[PDB]
Amino acid sequence: DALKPPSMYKVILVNDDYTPMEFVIDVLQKFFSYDVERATQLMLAVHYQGKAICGVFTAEVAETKVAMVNKYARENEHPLLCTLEKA
Amino acid sequence: MLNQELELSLNMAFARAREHRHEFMTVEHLLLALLSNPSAREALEACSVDLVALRQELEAFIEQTTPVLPASEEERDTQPTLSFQRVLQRAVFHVQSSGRNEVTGANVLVAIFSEQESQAAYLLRKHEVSRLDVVNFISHGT
Ligand SMILES: [Zn+2]
Numbered sequence: 001d002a003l004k005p006p007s008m009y010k011v012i013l014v015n016d017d018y019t020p021m022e023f024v025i026d027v028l029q030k031f032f033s034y035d036v037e038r039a040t041q042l043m044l045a046v047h048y049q050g051k052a053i054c055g056v057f058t059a060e061v062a063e064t065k066v067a068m069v070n071k072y073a074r075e076n077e078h079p080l081l082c083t084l085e086k087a
Numbered sequence: 088m089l090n091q092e093l094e095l096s097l098n099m100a101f102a103r104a105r106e107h108r109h110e111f112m113t114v115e116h117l118l119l120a121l122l123s124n125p126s127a128r129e130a131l132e133a134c135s136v137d138l139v140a141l142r143q144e145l146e147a148f149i150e151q152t153t154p155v156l157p158a159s160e161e162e163r164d165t166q167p168t169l170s171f172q173r174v175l176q177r178a179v180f181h182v183q184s185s186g187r188n189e190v191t192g193a194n195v196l197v198a199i200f201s202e203q204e205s206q207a208a209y210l211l212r213k214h215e216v217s218r219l220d221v222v223n224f225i226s227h228g229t
Contacts, residue, residue, distance in 0.1 A: 002214055006204035033157055057153050059204035060170045061115055069171060 006061060008087035009062035010053045013069075015046050019078040027080065033071050056087050089175075089190045095125040096192060105165045110154040112167045114174055114199060118143040120208040124192030131196075131229045134216045141214060148206050170205055174198045197221050 011032075013024065028039040032054045036084055045052040057065065062084045069082035094190070102122035104112040121127035122138055122145075129140060156163065177198035182190050197208050200218035 003209070004210050006206060016111065030163075033154075033160075057154070058206060060168050060202070060206070061111060061152065061154065064111060064166070064168045068166075 007058045008056050009059050009084045011055050011057060011062050011069075012063050012083045012085065013042070013046050013052055014055055014081040014083060015050045016079050016081065019073070019080040021047070023073075023076065023078055023080065024087070026058050026071065027069055027082075031065060054082075088188055089179075092124055092126060093099045093190060093192045093195060096120045099120070101165065101167075105212065107150075108155050108156045108158075109149075109165055112165055114168065114170045114202055114205045114207045115145050115149050115153075116198060117171055117174065117195070118210070121151060121196055127192035130193045130221050131216070134220050136214045142211060144210055145207075146173045148210075152206075162166060169188045170202045171229075174202055176192075177183060177201055193221060193225050197225070209220045 008038070013027070024046060025039045026035065026044040028034045028042050029036065034042065042052050042054065056062075066082045069080070073080035073082070073087050097117075097120065101112050102118045103120075104116050109116075118184065119142065122131070122142055128138070131141075156165075174195060175198075178190050178195040181197060182188065182194050194212075197218055199211065200221075202208055
């Protein structure tokens with residue numbers, strides 16, 4: 001037999017044409033604890049690269065952060081999409 | 088109904104997590120708390136698990152991987168992970184699906200095995216405990 005630890009996951013913010021830059025920064029500060037400056041740099045990366053990694057967490061934590069972000073986007077009526085993928 | 092000892096375990100796990108300012112109460116906090124829940128503890132001893140080593144592996148993983156809320160942030164507090172919620176719901180489901188109602192720490196332990204990407208399930212299998220090991224113990228004793 002062979003057994004490995006579950007893997008770590010990248011949590012990603014995807015770009016869209018409707019979500020205001022201000023909300024993206026809000027999400028980065030509120031859910032990932034970035035200061036305004038780093039938050040702003042990540043927001044631009046999402047804008048130019050089309051996506052950006054907000055953090056790397058265990059599978060369990062990553063899944064929860066993703067659901068929290070998507071619920072907050074939904075409540076504020078923005079199609080901001082948060083996703084995860086194996087680190 | 089979650090029995091009294093299980094409920095004591097859950098509320099203290101949650102209080103401990105809040106005191107450490109953790110953003111999340113995880114399935115690992117849950118397993119760590121079950122180490123001293125009579126029902127789950129008995130099952131684990133019956134599987135010859137080194138509870139000292141498991142406790143340590145759980146505590147290390149928890150403090151190293153659980154984000155801490157900023158001393159600043161007082162508008163949001165400790166939340167259970169989705170995985171944690173599924174485990175409690177699965178434990179209730181397993182018990183009800185057998186026609187019973189009392190949920191013990193051992194039923195919660197059984198449900199942890201279904202969170203395959205959890206560190207908790209990993210650690211349990213690392214200590215050679217299978218879901219069926221716990222179910223046999225619950226059904227047939229040592
Ligand atoms: Zn802690």
